[PDB]
């Protein structure tokens, strides 16, 4: 849901911002909700690494819409280039992250 | 309870190896830092009774809280800071940011 | 037999034994030495 | 010795009826109570209750337990308190009170 925002119109500022702020609020309430299951251990589990990486991805898609909106009206070419790039970069890095994660935690 | 200090005498056996198994205690949150054995004679209105005290010192680990309650607030503040890079003409976006942040 | 000898000894010990009176009921205090082998500290509730 | 004291105790309980208060005919028993609050427990606001840990002391005069020996005060065990008469003080508003039994019954009798 945070990655769909890239494909939204570049002029629709109000929509992409709601996307970012929500996807972050949701990830926070879900990082406290899922955390509400385990006892109070002093180390980081595997689910907590997955949640941290997802939270990172979300905040990168946000930081990326913010960068595009700060570069638009000045260099729209640079904005178009970074948007057309992120639209591919993000999915492949999240796919390889899922592959690595499940491979390293299902073999033990 | 019943016997005053002129009828019974409490003392740790060994006086330092009396209490064992403290360095093997693994707590999920705290962590035993030190333990002490004391010997006193308390005074109540019915006499003076012997007393031993076994005292621990538990230091709380901060990993769980850094994980659970500090990081979400810190990152919510970071998100709130985004409202400055948006152009000041956007009236809904910035408001959304600040209000969601406050409520959260 | 050894078992009968021990049983006789124990019966002799507990015969004429007054539980209401501590050792040395009219003399100096008795010394009670304590040991503790802490198995676990389960939960520390705030 | 301890046989003089066993004999004293057996003389005390010989011919004692713990179903009769001291001075049943010609006297009104006078129980002098006292309390020592070792810790005022947490006041539960939901249940409108409160916990309190006390040293509840009582002291009456029993004329059937007079002796004459080497000692003045017999600091006896808490199991002698069940063979004599002890007032049945109950708490008019207590809900669930517990008497501690760790490691032996937390009682006293002098
Ligand atoms: C945890 O808290 C307890 C409670 O305060 C601490 O117990 C205290 O320990 C100190 C040092 O062991 C005691 O000092 C002693 O005072 C007597 C007084 O005559 C003196 O003779 C000794 O040489 C020593 O200076 C102190 O009395 C004692 N407090 C009580 C109320 O017993 C304990 O140290 C703390 N730390 C740990 C690890 O438990
Ligand atoms: C509180 O603690 C006291 C002492 O630790 C407990 O007293 C013990 O109670 C048991 C059973 O009530 C007694 O065993 C009984 O022995 C008689 C023989 O006299 C036998 O016929 C019974 O079948 C039973 O086995 C035990 O002797 C007694 N010990 C003492 C020292 O008084 C008491 O039960 C505890 N109460 C609670 C609620 O835990």
Domain ranges of chain A: 1-108
Q: A31, A35, A32: which is closest to A55 by C-alpha?
A: A31
Resolution expressed in Å: 3.0
C26 close contact with D: CB closer than 8 A: yes
Can you list the positions of beta strands (E) in chain D?
34-40, 52-57
| Coil, helix or strand at residue D9 | helix
Q: Which residues of C touch D109 (CB under 8 A)?
A: none
Judged on CB neighbours under 10 Å (0-12, 13-18, 19+), D99 is exposed
Could you tell me which residues of chain A have a Cβ less than 8 Å from any Cβ in chain B?
13-14, 17-18, 20-22, 24-25, 28, 31-32, 35, 39-44, 48, 55, 59, 62, 66, 69-70
Method: cryo-EM
Residues in Cβ contact with D24 at an 8 Å cutoff, skipping those fewer than 6 apart:
none
Q: What is d(CA A92, CA A94) in angstroms, rounded to the nearest whole number?
A: 5
A15 touches B56 (CB < 8 A): no
Can you list the positions of beta strands (E) in C1-46?
30-34, 36-37
Residues in Cβ contact with D83 at an 8 Å cutoff, skipping those fewer than 6 apart:
D13, D16, D18
C21 close contact with D: CB closer than 8 A: yes
B101 touches B79 (CB < 8 A): yes
How many angstroms away from the CA of D81 is the closest CA of chain B? 12
Q: Which residues of C touch D77 (CB under 8 A)?
A: 19-22
**Ligand 2 in reach of D24 Cβ (< 6 A):** no
**Number of other CB atoms surrounding residue D45 within 10 Å:** 8
End-to-end CA distance of chain D: 19
From the centroid of its chain, how far is CA A33?
A: 18
Token reading at A49: 């690494």
Looking at residue B68, what DSSP letter applies? I
From the centroid of its chain, how far is CA D57?
A: 7
Length of chain A counted residue by residue: 108
Residues in Cβ contact with B94 at an 8 Å cutoff, skipping those fewer than 6 apart:
B83, B86, B88
Looking at residue D109, what DSSP letter applies? B
A103 touches A92 (CB < 8 A): no
B2 touches B19 (CB < 8 A): no
Helix (H) or strand (E) holding B48, with range, is strand B47-58
Q: What is d(CA A73, CA A13) in angstroms, rounded to the nearest whole number?
A: 13
Buried b (16+ CB within 10 A) or exposed e, A21-38: bebbbebbeebeeebeee
Angle subtended at Cα B88 by Cα B87 and Cα B93, rounded to the nearest 5 degrees: 80
**Number of other CB atoms surrounding residue A61 within 10 Å:** 23
End-to-end CA distance of chain B: 54
């Amino acid at each position: 849901l945070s990655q769909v925002s890239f494909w939204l119109n570049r002029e629709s500022v109000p929509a992409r911002t709601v996307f970012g702020v929500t996807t972050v609020l949701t990830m926070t309430t879900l990082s406290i909700s899922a955390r509400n299951s385990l006892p109070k251990v002093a180390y980081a589990t595997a689910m907590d690494w997955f949640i941290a990486v997802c939270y990172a991805f979300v905040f990168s898609a946000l930081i990326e819409f913010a960068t595009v909106n700060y570069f638009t009206k000045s260099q729209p070419a640079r904005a178009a280039k970074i948007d057309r790039l992120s639209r591919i970069a993000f999915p492949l890095l999240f796919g390889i992250f899922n592959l690595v994660y499940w491979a390293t935690y299902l073999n033990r | 309870y019943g016997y005053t200090t002129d009828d019974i005498e409490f003392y740790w056996r060994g006086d330092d190896n009396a209490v064992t198994g403290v360095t093997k205690i693994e707590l999920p949150q705290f962590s035993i830092v030190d333990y002490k054995l004391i010997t006193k004679k308390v005074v109540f209105s019915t006499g003076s009774y012997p007393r031993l005290s076994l005292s621990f010192k538990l230091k709380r680990n901060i990993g769980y809280f850094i994980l659970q309650t500090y990081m979400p607030s810190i990152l919510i503040t970071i998100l709130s800071w985004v409202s400055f890079w948006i152009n000041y003409d956007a009236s809904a976006a910035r408001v959304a940011l600040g209000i969601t942040t406050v409520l959260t | 037999s050894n078992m009968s000898l021990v049983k006789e000894t124990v019966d002799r010990l507990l015969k004429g034994y007054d539980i209401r009176l501590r050792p040395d009921f009219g003399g100096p205090p008795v010394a009670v030495g304590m040991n503790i082998d802490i198995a676990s500290i389960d939960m520390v509730s705030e | 010795n301890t046989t003089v004291f066993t004999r004293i105790l057996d003389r005390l309980l010989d011919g004692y009826d713990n179903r009769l208060r001291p001075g049943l005919g010609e006297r009104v028993t006078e129980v002098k109570t006292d309390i020592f609050v070792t810790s005022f427990g947490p006041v539960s606001d939901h249940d409108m209750e409160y916990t309190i840990d006390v040293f509840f002391r009582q002291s009456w005069k029993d004329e059937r337990l007079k002796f004459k020996g080497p000692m003045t005060v017999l600091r006896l065990n808490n199991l002698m308190a069940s063979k004599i008469w002890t007032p049945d003080t109950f708490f008019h508003n207590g809900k669930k009170s517990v008497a501690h039994n760790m490691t032996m019954p937390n009682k006293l009798l002098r």
